[PDB]
């Protein structure tokens, strides 16, 4: 009958792992909690609010490199931040779908101001710092979203033979599956950082 | 009572725009088609197969730069391909969620072999060509997925004031919204291409 933040978020993350993001509804959560829906409303007004709370919790638990570390290079900060963000998105079933569209709350503002102060002090324009961080965020989401979906689709589709593909495509696809999700993420992340370096050197 | 590819895919893309990807089911489609479900089964065995057909159709209609164009530079090919892919993902409601996890069929193999032949003839290793294309694909998906979700979330959440944010975050967020989806996509795409150039120059 009684709720608080921690009770509602712990039950919701277990439900997310049991049923996935489409399966998750405020009604199913109230039931798992053994509470009536109007008690739950004061804590999560709707699905959207629930998703946002769950995305923030996953970052609070697993996003260890949210903020720059003294005395990291900007390149190491961007790589570590992306890796940490990725770990948060992979922490739960459909975690990156949970994260899409999330807004910062006031408790992240200090962190997010420090990221920008740090990059601009490294020589980035404000605009270039914003889009370096945006590009890292969009590439990391895309990466995890595509990974997480192939995983789901395999219960649902005939598993494809590569035998009949033409030679370069066969070799590329077999190599992409062989090396797996983390090497593809690290290769793209490195290409982004190299591009940021090139653009920064110009500018100044 | 009668089906063929075009009838089923046209009705399904209109239903996608009416109800979005979660709203789309094979049963609701059979109803819109005025057909019984076993007739539909021979054309789409389940949701997964339906999604895959819809993702391929959106590329067949809107992905104009699927293949390299003679005599494009590799940088122009990668930029144009990404822009064309983006247009396909934006063509319908939830289009990028439709595209997640899609597998090529045999009719794309020629196209996809030509992309790789083209990049390796430009001096890429097979591995580096594969992950340049992967990184462009993941960044573009991420970009569109995040855009498409903020759009949805606005019917569902109090629209946030930036007034109380600290000065760099306030300026960055206001600038990201001001310039909009396409400039953020183009900035990330350009950073990727610059990074590819840097890595290619090394190598050889």
């Amino acid at each position: 009958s009684r709720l608080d933040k921690s009770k509602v978020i712990n039950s919701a993350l277990e439900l997310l792992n049991e049923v996935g993001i489409e399966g998750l509804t405020t009604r199913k959560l109230a039931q798992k909690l053994g509470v009536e829906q109007p008690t739950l409303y004061w804590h999560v007004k709707n699905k959207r609010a629930l998703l946002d709370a769950l995305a923030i919790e996953m970052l609070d638990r697993h996003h260890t490199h949210f903020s720059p570390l003294e005395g990291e290079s900007w390149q190491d900060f961007l790589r570590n931040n992306a890796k940490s963000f990725r770990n948060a998105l992979l922490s739960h079933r459909d975690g990156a779908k949970v994260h899409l569209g999330t807004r910062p709350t006031e408790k992240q503002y200090e962190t997010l101001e420090n990221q920008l102060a740090f990059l601009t002090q490294q020589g980035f324009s404000l605009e270039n710092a914003l889009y370096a961080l945006s590009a890292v965020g969009h590439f990391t989401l895309g990466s995890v979203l595509e990974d997480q979906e192939h995983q789901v689709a395999k219960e649902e589709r005939e598993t494809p033979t590569t035998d009949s593909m033409p030679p370069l495509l066969r070799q590329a696809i077999e190599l992409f599956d062989h090396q797996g999700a983390e090497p593809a993420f690290l290769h793209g992340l490195e290409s982004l950082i190299r591009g940021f370096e090139v653009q920064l050197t110009a500018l100044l | 009572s009668r089906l063929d590819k075009s009838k089923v895919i046209n009705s399904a893309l209109e239903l996608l725009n009416e109800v979005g990807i979660e709203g789309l089911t094979t049963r609701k489609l059979a109803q819109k088609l005025g057909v019984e479900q076993p007739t539909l089964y021979w054309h789409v065995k389940n949701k997964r197969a339906l999604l895959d057909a819809l993702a391929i159709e959106m590329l067949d209609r809107h992905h104009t730069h699927f293949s390299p164009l003679e005599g494009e530079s590799w940088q122009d090919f990668l930029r144009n391909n990404a822009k064309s892919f983006r247009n396909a993902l934006l063509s319908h409601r939830d289009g990028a969620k439709v595209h997640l996890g899609t597998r090529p069929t045999e009719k794309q193999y020629e196209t996809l072999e030509n992309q790789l032949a083209f990049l390796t003839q430009q001096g890429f290793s097979l591995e580096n060509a594969l992950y340049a294309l992967s990184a462009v694909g993941h960044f573009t998906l991420g970009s569109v997925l995040e855009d498409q979700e903020h759009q949805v979330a606005k019917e569902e959440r109090e629209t946030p004031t930036t007034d109380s944010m600290p000065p760099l975050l306030r300026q960055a967020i206001e600038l990201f919204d001001h310039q909009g989806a396409e400039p953020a996509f183009l900035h990330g795409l350009e950073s990727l291409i610059r990074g590819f150039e840097v890595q290619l120059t090394a190598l050889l």
């Binding site: 995305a55 970052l59 996003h63 949210f66 931040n81 992306a82 963000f85 948060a88 994260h99 999330t102 807004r103 910062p104 992240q108 914003l130 961080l133 945006s134 890292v136 965020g137 969009h138 990391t140 989401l141 | 991420g142 995040e146 855009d147 903020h150 759009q151 606005k154 629209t159 946030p160 004031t161 930036t162 007034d163 960055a172 967020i173 206001e174 990201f176 919204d177 909009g180 989806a181 953020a184």
Partner: peptide, 12 residues
């Protein structure tokens, strides 16, 4: 409030 935005970058 004076200013609102309708699109945000990913949070991380």
């Amino acid at each position: 409030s004076r200013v609102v935005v309708w699109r945000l970058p990913p949070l991380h």
